Design a protein around this ligand. Structure first.
Ligand SMILES: N=C(N)c1ccc2[nH]c(-c3cccc(C4(O)CCCCC4)n3)cc2c1
Length: 361
């Protein structure tokens, strides 16, 4: 597990960044911009936000395994997308440094050809229902925000008073069921605007009230900044979708394990013939048999790593589309979440108070 270059102490929340030139960790020198440095640092690592921050003092706190300090270029800060771009080594005379409490995520506090799952195993999984029926899955990013697919909201399914967000249970008939205040969908999603090309198949659901965080309801993390999708890696897709294309929805949330498939193979004529656009990837088996399906759309494709020095699940894909379900040489296609990190943050930063359907290019 090659560590992410930005870390946050589980003990006291100190932020630490890696020095390429020396192999050491350095603290971040406190400054007038502590708040954005905090948020930016959480964003960087793949957490949604900094809930709170504070100043620590090396006289009362210890270096705790760090050699010196980085300083943040506050002029560049508000315009950077990368923390690693705005820091330089500095003396930090006053020995005061930054700590940040991030919105925790990716951690447990306990579909075709998959298995019945248990409660708390996938606590970010939500069911998105219109008029009483399950149409789509989604993934909690906080208690009030859900990441799902744009295609879940075509013309007829745009009356928000009719959507509900079901969380906290794995059986469809069990749990908490809340309203929706807004939907921010991607304006680069050509079909919503003919019909087209499924790039930018991504939307955010803002619930009219936040869910409690429990052992059954937790957010997922996001891919950290610059984090690559690793081909062949086995990740997990879950949902209440159909267990055969021409079948019934699962009554109990299912899970299935599927490897990432390189675009080399997936774009191949044997497979998808150049239909796999660069913000999409495929996952599944050349043989077929295990796949997501109708009604898993919007739900989580999650991959577990240890790059934050503790095991974490991160939402690497969103169930977008496929030609049938579980077909040999037709794997699942997913939205590449890492490619929409700044879009997710901008949307939430901009449309937090909005109501209705909002387009964000
Ligand atoms: N093999 C796969 N991985 C895969 C993934 C995702 C998939 N969605 C569908 C499909 C087919 C007909 C209608 C729909 C609706 O999207 C259902 C939700 C609301 C709008 C209409 N989805 C197939 C399919 C296959």
């Amino acid at each position: 597990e090659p560590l992410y270059p930005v870390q946050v102490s589980s003990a006291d929340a100190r932020l630490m960044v890696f020095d390429k030139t020396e192999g050491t960790w350095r603290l971040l020198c406190s400054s007038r911009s502590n708040a954005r440095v905090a948020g930016l640092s959480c964003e960087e690592m793949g957490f949604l936000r900094a809930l709170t921050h504070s100043e620590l003092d090396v006289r009362t706190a210890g270096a705790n395994g760090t050699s010196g300090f980085f300083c943040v270029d506050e002029g560049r800060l508000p315009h950077t997308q990368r923390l690693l771009e705005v820091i330089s080594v500095c003396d930090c005379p006053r020995g005061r440094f930054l700590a940040a409490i991030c919105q925790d995520c990716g951690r447990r506090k306990l579909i075709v050809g998959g298995r019945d799952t248990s409660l708390g195993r996938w606590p970010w999984q939500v069911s998105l229902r219109y008029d009483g029926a399950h149409l789509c899955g989604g993934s909690l990013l906080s208690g009030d925000w859900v990441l799902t697919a744009a295609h879940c909201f075509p013309e007829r399914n745009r009356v928000l008073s009719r959507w509900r967000v079901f969380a906290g249970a794995v059986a469809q008939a069990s749990g908490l069921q809340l309203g929706v205040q807004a939907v921010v969908y991607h304006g680069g999603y050509l079909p919503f605007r003919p019909n087209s090309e499924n790039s930018n198949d991504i939307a955010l659901v803002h619930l009219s009230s936040p869910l409690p965080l429990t052992e059954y309801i937790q957010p997922v993390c996001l891919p950290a900044a610059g984090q690559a999708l690793v081909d062949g890696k086995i990740c997990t897709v879950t949902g209440w979708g159909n267990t055969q294309y021409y079948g019934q929805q699962a009554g109990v949330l299912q899970e299935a394990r599927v490897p990432i498939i390189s675009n080399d193979v997936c774009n191949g004529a044997d497979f998808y013939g150049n239909q796999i656009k660069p913000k999409m990837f495929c996952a599944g088996y050349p043989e077929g048999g295990i796949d997501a399906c109708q009604g898993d759309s919007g739900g989580p494709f999650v991959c577990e790593d240890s790059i934050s020095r503790t095991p974490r699940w991160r939402l690497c894909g969103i169930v977008s589309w496929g030609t049938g379900c579980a077909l040999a040489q037709k794997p699942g296609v997913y939205t590449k979440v890492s490619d929409f990190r700044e879009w997710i943050f901008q949307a939430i930063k901009t449309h937090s108070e909005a109501s209705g359907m909002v387009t964000q290019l």
